[PDB]
Amino acid sequence: ATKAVCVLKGDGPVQGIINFEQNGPVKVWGSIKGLTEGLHGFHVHEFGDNCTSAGPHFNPLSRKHGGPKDEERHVGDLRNVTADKDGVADVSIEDSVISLSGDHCIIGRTLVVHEKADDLGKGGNEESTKTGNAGSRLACGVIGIA
Amino acid sequence: TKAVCVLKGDGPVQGIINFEQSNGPVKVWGSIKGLTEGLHGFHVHEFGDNTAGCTSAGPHFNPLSRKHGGPKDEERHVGDLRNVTADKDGVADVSIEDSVISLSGDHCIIGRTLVVHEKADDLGKGGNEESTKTGNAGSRLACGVIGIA
């Protein structure tokens, strides 16, 4: 019955709040503003160092980057969030790999939203297997106990 | 094990505090700028929730359900650190060691908020009710969620 929250901010105008609630799936929802219309990579990264210092995608099992439904993905690979014309992304997803307890606990890690869409590891180049070619980290926030 | 916290607020106050640690002491160090010269309250609060700025961080981390006190007092909250000291330039270079907090286990502070205050923490030695709760440290000038490093 644990809950977590992350406030996203960056150098640009992007800002948002993302909630987390949980061996059960983790429900993830909230809103992000200041985004350009389009799909945006959304991942939990390794270090809760507020966005270049966040490190790579949270990868405790040392796996290759993938999409949320792939058996091969980083624990932090959540999905692309969608921002409408008004630059707002309403987030509402359920993820089975992250957790707020145990080996895949994300409390104290960073949540990062990217400039471009995540190719989910299916891009055909090496970078795809690492970051999904999602581009700059527009905003991030440390995941905290709510 | 190592943790880091980036402190930010509505104003000039910003800093970075590192934590480095079993039951061994936790070394806390870093610097905070933009502070008025003098003492400023410094505690780990219960929640790592910054949705309302520092206001939503909750009270001081107090897993053992005790009254507020100074860091070296018998009775204190786990999150009660000593006041930080800002110099003439408004800079507080912090270097503290605490054996009550922890980066692992129960009194783990990762995921919680570090907060720096407007006034000095009176260590619970004040002449009122609130002293036993907040040390009368006043408003929260900056804060940040303690993250894994």
Ligand SMILES: [Cu+]
């Ligand atoms: Cu990312």
Ligand SMILES: [Cu+]
């Ligand atoms: Cu405080």
Ligand SMILES: [Zn+2]
């Ligand atoms: Zn990834």
Ligand SMILES: [Zn+2]
């Ligand atoms: Zn206290």
